[PDB]
Amino acid sequence: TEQEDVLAKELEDVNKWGLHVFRIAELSGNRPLTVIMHTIFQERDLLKTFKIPVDTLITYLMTLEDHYHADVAYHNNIHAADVVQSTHVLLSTPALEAVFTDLEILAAIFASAIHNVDHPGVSNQFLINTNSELALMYNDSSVLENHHLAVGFKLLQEENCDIFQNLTKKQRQSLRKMVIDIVLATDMSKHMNLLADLKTMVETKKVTSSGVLLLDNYSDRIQVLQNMVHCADLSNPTKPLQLYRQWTDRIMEEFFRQGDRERERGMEISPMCDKHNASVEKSQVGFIDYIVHPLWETWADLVHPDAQDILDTLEDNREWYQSTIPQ
Amino acid sequence: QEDVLAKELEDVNKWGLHVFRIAELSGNRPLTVIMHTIFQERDLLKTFKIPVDTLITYLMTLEDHYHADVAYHNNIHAADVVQSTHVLLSTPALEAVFTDLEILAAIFASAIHNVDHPGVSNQFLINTNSELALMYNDSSVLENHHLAVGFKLLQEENCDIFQNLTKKQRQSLRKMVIDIVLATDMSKHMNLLADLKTMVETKKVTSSGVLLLDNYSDRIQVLQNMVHCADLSNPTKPLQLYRQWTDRIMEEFFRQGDRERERGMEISPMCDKHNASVEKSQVGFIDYIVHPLWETWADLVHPDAQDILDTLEDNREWYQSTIPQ
Ligand SMILES: Nc1ncnc2c1ncn2[C@@H]1O[C@@H]2COP(=O)(O)O[C@H]2[C@H]1O
Ligand SMILES: Nc1ncnc2c1ncn2[C@@H]1O[C@@H]2COP(=O)(O)O[C@H]2[C@H]1O
Ligand SMILES: [Zn+2]
Ligand SMILES: [Zn+2]
């Protein structure tokens, strides 16, 4: 019964990188997305700011969480909760103080919460190559991302689920656009272009009298939020090793299952999905070297020196995985 | 009747085909009869081993999904865009520039480009928080839907007209069609035209004046513009046809405006029947959209599009003359 006290204790670390999200998932009876989102909304006073009825928020969150699949090892409600909490921490970085409006903050967090809802455990390419109904619906482009958005928004229409019921028409319109822009940017096929623009921004960065980042147009503002959520989505390798390894174990299980389906169909097996020819350690070093570090090193420069500890952890984790290779 | 229809279809290769007459003489099956005629004309059934019964079955099914109660965006418009693309594909300057598969894609794309159109615009669907807009995240809403429906119908009993195409040919065709239809989104017109101009400025042709394309990027770009031109070809057709198209689109527009007014929404351009100037609208449409596009296409295939451009300018002059004062 006092399990509630332990859960409440763990939630006290909501503003910290390295939150025990798996512990929270268990303590909450598999409701990590609901309790973490609720905690963050309270912390940021979002219910008051946007006049969100608490029962409406909880009802929508439970419904949203219900639409993530419990039988998918990585792309589930725990991942959603993790991305939400990570985005929440990134939004609080000193270099971004007073930069974003409450609506933009709300957009980034909501986008993080719905960014992978109803994920089937297989990639866009798998869905395209197998002529899936989802790929048919979305014409082979940002198939899953479009779906995550459609489901996330559609659920707002369920009984007592419209958490944005008291926003003005203009606020709702702006929020919807920002959320779409953010989730569509999580498509890995857009990673290189997204990173290229972030690098350009860092190279031409301008700060205010306080040293805080200066963003004076939608293009730049949405770009930072897109990269912020993308960094959160790719934050596993930057977390304490015990968390990172659990995430890796989970994604490998999901990858291997996709590989088994591809093999059975006579399809070429996707990278990292062949359990018979796998090099988990080498794959993590590659993932960090070619994707995660290039991105995070750039984000760290944008908010320097705010993310130095996060970058240090990432580099330590890369060294650790690399050390398991010299055989 | 079947004799009259057969005779009208004899001009399938001519700009200005009596598409409305064909729609009447075919029991409102202009898309099916015109697509079939074009496929036979290009020997596409034998080339891609397309069972006649399969093609007809798919075509009738596709045509059935265009709304007969929508004045403009219906099966007649689809048939007209298909026939217009078919003629533009026979442009001397583009002779032998495209493969049979690419030709099949351009024509297929034209046939399905507006399927299941509800009679209202993307902006209307977005502003009314429609299910379509919810599904497609306010991004090229109708275009995405037209493609989804067009492809899904191929899965109906005896409707897979691409059944005998190789796995790669099917993948290639699907990609080209998506690329083409998404390009019909008017919100992409200015960028599409801008890039067309760029192509014209650096174009390269043979001694005989045949256009030289170097890769898929070039070939698909020309195809996107070709179909876009076909979609915006009404003002370049014989006046009798152009006026019928205008009457039809205005009716569709006014009906949308009535819905916007009732909902308390801002009425879209040309949709307010109480403050409408049809003639002035046509002149503006030609001056800012249609002429700039066709003048550019004309240069690309110079001088094969001169007659089309001449007709457009004649129609512009006529519509302007219907404006008093
Ligand atoms: N721990 C991880 N190890 C390897 N690849 C990962 C890991 N976390 C995320 N990814 C990859 O990063 C991608 C981010 O977007 P997706 O969820 O589409 O797919 C994810 C994987 O391809
Ligand atoms: N005859 C016409 N008169 C006015 N506008 C037209 C005419 N034909 C096409 N259009 C416009 O061109 C657009 C082409 O794409 P849409 O069908 O989305 O919407 C069409 C109209 O906005
Ligand atoms: Zn994710
Ligand atoms: Zn059209």
Curated annotation (Swiss-Prot), chain A:
Q: Where in the cell is it found?
A: Apical cell membrane; Cytoplasm; Membrane; Cytoplasm, Cytoskeleton
Q: Where does 3',5'-cyclic AMP bind?
A: 75, 284, 287
Q: In which tissues is it expressed?
A: Expressed in colonic epithelial cells (at protein level). Widespread; most abundant in skeletal muscle.
The UniProt-reported impact of residue 140 to R is: Abolishes homodimerization
PTM note says: Long isoforms that share a conserved PKA phosphorylation site in the N-terminus are activated by PKA through phosphorylation. Isoform 3 and isoform 7 are activated by phosphorylation (in vitro), but not isoform 6.
Q: Which residues participate directly in catalysis?
A: 75 (proton donor)
What family does this belong to? Belongs to the cyclic nucleotide phosphodiesterase family. PDE4 subfamily.
Name-wise, this protein is 3',5'-cyclic-AMP phosphodiesterase 4D
Q: What range of the intact protein is shown?
A: 388 to 714 of 809
